[PDB]
Motif scaffolding. Sequence first.
Motif, mmCIF file in Angstrom:
data_model
loop_
_atom_site.group_PDB
_atom_site.id
_atom_site.type_symbol
_atom_site.label_atom_id
_atom_site.label_comp_id
_atom_site.label_asym_id
_atom_site.label_seq_id
_atom_site.Cartn_x
_atom_site.Cartn_y
_atom_site.Cartn_z
ATOM 1 N N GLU A 1 -5.092 -10.704 7.869
ATOM 2 C CA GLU A 1 -5.390 -11.169 8.213
ATOM 3 C C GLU A 1 -7.043 -11.613 7.466
ATOM 4 O OE1 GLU A 1 -5.190 -12.119 11.439
ATOM 5 O OE2 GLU A 1 -6.794 -12.988 12.730
ATOM 6 N N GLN A 2 -7.748 -11.186 6.810
ATOM 7 C CA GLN A 2 -8.744 -11.378 6.064
ATOM 8 C C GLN A 2 -8.044 -12.657 4.621
ATOM 9 O OE1 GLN A 2 -10.935 -7.717 5.475
ATOM 10 N NE2 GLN A 2 -12.501 -8.589 6.719
ATOM 11 N N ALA A 3 -7.062 -11.932 4.083
ATOM 12 C CA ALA A 3 -6.747 -12.906 2.835
ATOM 13 C C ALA A 3 -5.847 -14.465 3.228
ATOM 14 C CB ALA A 3 -5.175 -12.181 2.434
ATOM 15 N N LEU A 4 -5.688 -14.467 5.182
ATOM 16 C CA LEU A 4 -5.025 -15.537 4.590
ATOM 17 C C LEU A 4 -6.586 -16.790 5.041
ATOM 18 C CD1 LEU A 4 -2.250 -15.530 7.992
ATOM 19 C CD2 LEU A 4 -2.197 -16.794 5.858
ATOM 20 N N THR B 1 0.626 -0.728 -0.284
ATOM 21 C CA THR B 1 0.118 0.003 -0.443
ATOM 22 C C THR B 1 0.941 1.307 0.400
ATOM 23 O OG1 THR B 1 -1.730 1.341 1.139
ATOM 24 C CG2 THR B 1 0.310 0.415 2.631
ATOM 25 N N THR B 2 -0.125 2.268 -0.408
ATOM 26 C CA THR B 2 1.061 3.698 -0.638
ATOM 27 C C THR B 2 0.101 5.199 0.448
ATOM 28 O OG1 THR B 2 1.600 2.653 -3.072
ATOM 29 C CG2 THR B 2 1.811 5.145 -2.706
ATOM 30 N N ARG B 3 1.716 5.522 1.243
ATOM 31 C CA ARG B 3 1.141 6.325 1.616
ATOM 32 C C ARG B 3 1.312 7.748 1.273
ATOM 33 N NH1 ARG B 3 -3.792 3.808 4.995
ATOM 34 N NH2 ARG B 3 -3.107 6.244 6.024
ATOM 35 N N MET C 1 -2.527 -2.928 6.145
ATOM 36 C CA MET C 1 -1.913 -4.127 5.961
ATOM 37 C C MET C 1 -2.078 -5.373 6.466
ATOM 38 S SD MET C 1 -1.018 -3.268 3.326
ATOM 39 C CE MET C 1 0.499 -4.688 2.778
ATOM 40 N N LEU C 2 -1.980 -5.293 8.144
ATOM 41 C CA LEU C 2 -2.762 -6.243 8.873
ATOM 42 C C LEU C 2 -3.933 -7.047 8.939
ATOM 43 C CD1 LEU C 2 -0.766 -5.734 12.087
ATOM 44 C CD2 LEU C 2 -0.533 -7.107 10.603
ATOM 45 N N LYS C 3 -4.727 -5.951 8.937
ATOM 46 C CA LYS C 3 -5.721 -6.114 8.453
ATOM 47 C C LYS C 3 -6.349 -6.951 7.735
ATOM 48 C CE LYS C 3 -10.904 -4.639 7.974
ATOM 49 N NZ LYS C 3 -11.966 -3.596 7.932
ATOM 50 N N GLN D 1 0.225 7.903 10.207
ATOM 51 C CA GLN D 1 0.312 7.735 8.566
ATOM 52 C C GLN D 1 0.142 6.483 8.936
ATOM 53 O OE1 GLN D 1 -2.312 9.548 6.589
ATOM 54 N NE2 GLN D 1 -2.118 10.389 8.157
ATOM 55 N N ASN D 2 1.538 6.206 8.822
ATOM 56 C CA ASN D 2 2.501 4.630 8.933
ATOM 57 C C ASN D 2 2.440 4.195 10.295
ATOM 58 O OD1 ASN D 2 5.247 4.017 7.406
ATOM 59 N ND2 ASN D 2 5.503 3.145 8.943
ATOM 60 N N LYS D 3 1.429 4.600 10.742
ATOM 61 C CA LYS D 3 1.113 3.359 12.137
ATOM 62 C C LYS D 3 -0.720 2.810 11.176
ATOM 63 C CE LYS D 3 2.678 5.801 16.218
ATOM 64 N NZ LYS D 3 3.759 5.537 16.066
ATOM 65 N N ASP D 4 -1.111 4.180 10.685
ATOM 66 C CA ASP D 4 -2.379 3.157 9.950
ATOM 67 C C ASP D 4 -1.959 2.968 8.448
ATOM 68 O OD1 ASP D 4 -3.589 5.664 11.815
ATOM 69 O OD2 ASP D 4 -4.449 6.456 9.788
#
Lengths: 52, 52
Positions: free
Chosen positions: B49-52, B14-16, B44-46, B36-39
């Motif tokens: 998690e859904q792609a797994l 993803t790009t910020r 990406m974590l979510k 912005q980095n934390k967001d």
Amino acid sequence: NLSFTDQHIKFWKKIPKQKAYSTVEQYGQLLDYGRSQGAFVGEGVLPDTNDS
Amino acid sequence: TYARKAAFVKFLGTTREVTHPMTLVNSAFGNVIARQNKDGILWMLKQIEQAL
């Protein structure tokens, strides 16, 4: 140089500069001191009130 | 009976972006690049998690 210099720009060098901290800057104004009325009072008499 | 399998590596990203005046103004909540980095990390974590 055969063109203008920084000395030929008179309005930019005369206007004062202040630092800004955001894309919207706010300021306040004082428009009036109060309505016109009498200012002479008797001895031991409460004067009237006024607002700006 | 024996077998030999293979797995393929995939890519996520993803790009910020932050504009220049946003980096100059006085902003609450602290630094903006870290926010912005934390967001981006949480998004990406979510997604992982859904792609797994």
